[PDB]
């Protein structure tokens, strides 16, 4: 409820915009996607969903768009309008303060642009507002990004596991200043392992080819994203302990001229999204040739995020791990 | 509304652990309670905001007959588990709820609490601690008994320049084609509004500190809604005053012994560090000059304070006026 207030306050700070804008892979790929697909913009009507500082709307204008509606719900809207004026684009970019679910637009649009992707793609639940915005999209219209692929792969990383395990085991102490805390170990492990780990890693820690789950933004309905079910079956390529699942995502800007990809894969140049790892509370032993199967379930919550459920098992042994994660509250290990 | 987020934060075992592991903090509380055993032996105790229960366990180690441990977060349930597993059900009673809303079955001899935040007053929990005196027997004691806030002018060219280094990101005429320069002034203002949390060498301090004292035995809840701290500094060192540094001490004034808990820069580091409020316009002062003004802390709806600092060099008449948001500190400690 009031969780939404804090969400939009976060985006009101220029300090946050600076960090975002300094992701050169993010900013550069968006610009390339838009400019190299200029025919998708030339003399067209554009909607920018959550424009922030206005940067994507400026790209749209660079690509020759006739009119851009730049919708922003935080007080960043005021700073956007300052930039539109100072950059002499008042005749083309129209900042509209407010939520995209609530504002009126005078016109339907040829193309929607946005950066709705959060950590693990889904965090922030902005994909829903992005899909909601399709009420303004003409029949023959496009969305940038067009689709999104989430990848997941099993990883081995004892150092990470043991760091999180060691923190939780503070609550295994039997005489902390003479007090037995040990009755709370189970609660601590639950809590610490509930946090997804945001950082990057060497790809050599991945034990199988990634499973991918695609969302088509042209086709999906807002309601589809309330419950996201991702089944998986990994064919294990290396033997060892599986400490959890690594997550990343790519998005594609499928234009009339080119498809441009923005990847957050660990094989690609680093972005501010990094990668996301969900640890198992207890690792699963797998041998090469084994199959690790189960289900990643994402359930939309009232905190602009998802409750994550990961159930995984080594088919050959019946060894099973069940995990609950709180995507809203990641551990930023970088 | 932001009270809900406040209590959610303390519902995490990791946040409780953060404070428990502050050795200076937790060890000093234990030593103040145990070394003043006669203030506790066979006595009735109220622990305001018991969290994990750790201070209530210390009161039990010191021989208290009965300890009412009040906790408003869901941490109350975990504290209860610890009381059971430590076989202290007969002596420690966990009462879930806000100290302003629950009922106690009897009046107490002594109130213990750790309600300090940054610059002493952040989080406004001292209002709850003072509110709790409605449960205190006449001539009952409080641990801590008094609190001192210290302020002193500092010089720190590196810290000051940093603000411009960061804000100057906006001072560029073609960021991917966009003139960002019109936002530089707003970016500067933003950074100066955040109090800086980290530690420093005492050599940066330009004058003897002044102190503002709260006597918890005497103070009323309402006294903390507006805190006016006048200051006159007779300058020890010539230089540019880049702002005011803040720290605090509390004293536990027991029957046997007074024990001090200090967060001073001359003392070992605690989880509170120290806090510096910068001046966007610095003040030049020579040794022997007097730097006078007022630091006014005005309580706000976000469990924090709006900080207004006005300072002048009496000899030159040159002044600096500053507004900071204590709810949004910059954590600089690296
Ligand atoms: N993480 C990227 C960020 C900026 C991207 C931008 N393109 C930048 O680079 O500046 C998303 C933006 O979307 C806004 N936002 C989120 N939801 C909504 C909404 N429902 N209605 C309007 N704005 C929203 C939110 O306040 C934020 O400023
Ligand atoms: N300062 C940190 C901590 C000390 C923990 C422990 N004592 C430690 O020293 O380790 C304060 C505790 O007070 C609770 N709290 C804050 N306000 C209230 C209130 N009005 N009513 C009940 N609980 C409150 C709050 O949820 C938190 O658990």
Residue numbers in the entry:
A (entry chain A): 143 to 476
B (entry chain B): 144 to 477
Tell me, in the authors' exact words, what the paper reports.
Protein arginine methyltransferases (PRMTs) act on their substrates to yield three different forms of methylated arginine: asymmetric dimethylarginine (ADMA), symmetric dimethylarginine (SDMA), and monomethylarginine (MMA), which are the terminal products of Type I, II and III PRMTs, respectively. Among the important Type I PRMTs is CARM1 (PRMT4), which regulates multiple aspects of transcription by methylating diverse targets including RNAPII, SRC3, C/EBPβ, PAX3/7, SOX2/9, RUNX1, Notch1, p300, CBP, p/CIP, Med12, and BAF155. The requirement of CARM1 is implicated in multiple cancers, with its methyltransferase activity particularly addicted by hematopoietic malignancies and metastatic breast cancer. Mechanistically, CARM1 methylates Arg1064 of BAF155 and thus facilitates the recruitment of the BAF155-containing SWI/SNF complex to a specific subset of gene loci that are essential for breast cancer metastasis.
Upon developing cofactor-competitive PMT inhibitors, we tailored the SAM analog sinefungin around its 6′-amino moiety to potentially engage CARM1’s substrate-binding pocket. 6′-homosinefungin (HSF, i.e., 1), a sinefungin analog with the insertion of 6′−methylene moiety, was discovered for its general high affinity to Type I PRMTs (Supplementary file 1-Table A). Given the tight CARM1 binding by 1, we solved the X-ray structure of CARM1 in complex with 1 (HSF) with a resolution of 2.00 Å. However, the CARM1–1 complex is distinct for multiple configurations of its ligand and interactions via its 6′-methyleneamine moiety. In the CARM1–1 complex, 1 can adopt four alternative configurations (Configuration I in Chains B, D; Configuration II in Chain C; Configuration III and IV in Chain A) accompanied with the structural accommodation of the adjacent residues and water hydrogen bonds (Supplementary file 1-Table B–D). The desired hydrogen-bond networks of the 6′-methyleneamine moiety of 1 with CARM1, which are present in the CARM1-1 complex but absent from the CARM1–SNF and CARM1–SAH complexes, can rationalize the significant decrease of IC50 from SNF and SAH to 1. Another key difference among CARM1–1, CARM1–SNF and CARM1–SAH complexes lies in the region around the carboxylate moiety of these ligands. In Chains A and C of the CARM1–1 complex, the carboxylate moiety of the ligand forms an ionic bond with Arg169 and a hydrogen bond with Gln160 (Supplementary file 1-Table B). In addition, 1 adopts the canonical pose with its α-amino carboxylate moiety interacting with Arg168, which is similar to that of SNF and SAH but different from the noncanonical pose of 2a and 5a, upon binding CARM1.
